[PDB]
């Protein structure tokens, strides 16, 4: 077997590594994307997935927008099959220091919880959105109470920070 999780906690598995490669070998079904909610797809995740889908993501997005409402931090929306057997879920995390940063985040995990098949997803609202990893995790673990989930990060420091979460 090839890409192995570097930590495992309940049915959540944590992977480090590049995106395309993860998608490629982990073969998911739902790729959760971290999107800033009026839906320009910039930075490590989104600018990533968009490119991988040949930019279909963005094409569906402008489309989406004409007959549907911008996504409200604390909400996510699903684009079914942006590729064949590849669904992208557009998660809008809260910014740092809006209110119930807490609650909002958890709904996002909660909504993610809800999907079908293999999920690959990054940690919401971490990175540019400047929310502590501790929390996005804290929330993650709480919410997706029971289902297999595939979380990925990019950095080392990230990877580590996660390990010490479980060690203490
Ligand atoms: Cl909703």
Curated annotation (Swiss-Prot):
Domain Macro span(s) in chain numbering: 1-168
Localization in the cell: Host membrane
Domain of life: Viruses
Catalytic activity: Thiol-dependent hydrolysis of ester, thioester, amide, peptide and isopeptide bonds formed by the C-terminal Gly of ubiquitin (a 76-residue protein attached to proteins as an intracellular targeting signal)
Bilayer topology: Multi-pass membrane protein
Residues spanning the signal sequence: none
Protein name, entry field: Non-structural protein 3
Organism field: Feline coronavirus (strain FIPV WSU-79/1146)
Residues of the full protein shown: 1331 to 1498 of 6709
């Amino acid at each position: 077997d090839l890409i192995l999780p570097f930590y495992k906690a309940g049915k959540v598995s944590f992977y480090q590594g590049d995106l395309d490669v993860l998608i490629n070998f982990l073969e998911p079904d739902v790729l959760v994307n971290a999107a800033n909610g009026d839906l320009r797809h910039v930075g490590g995740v989104a600018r990533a997935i968009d490119v991988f889908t040949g930019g279909k993501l963005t094409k569906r997005s402008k489309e989406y927008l004409k007959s549907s409402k911008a996504i409200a931090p604390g909400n996510a929306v699903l684009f079914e099959n942006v590729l064949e057997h590849l669904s992208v879920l557009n998660a809008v995390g809260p910014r740092n220091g809006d209110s119930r940063v807490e609650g909002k985040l958890c709904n996002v995990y909660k909504a993610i919880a809800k999907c079908d098949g293999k999920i690959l997803t990054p940690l919401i609202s971490v990175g540019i959105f400047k929310v502590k990893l501790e929390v996005s995790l804290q929330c993650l673990l709480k919410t997706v109470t029971d289902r297999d989930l595939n979380v990925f990060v990019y950095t080392d420091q990230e990877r580590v920070t996660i390990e010490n979460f479980f060690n203490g």
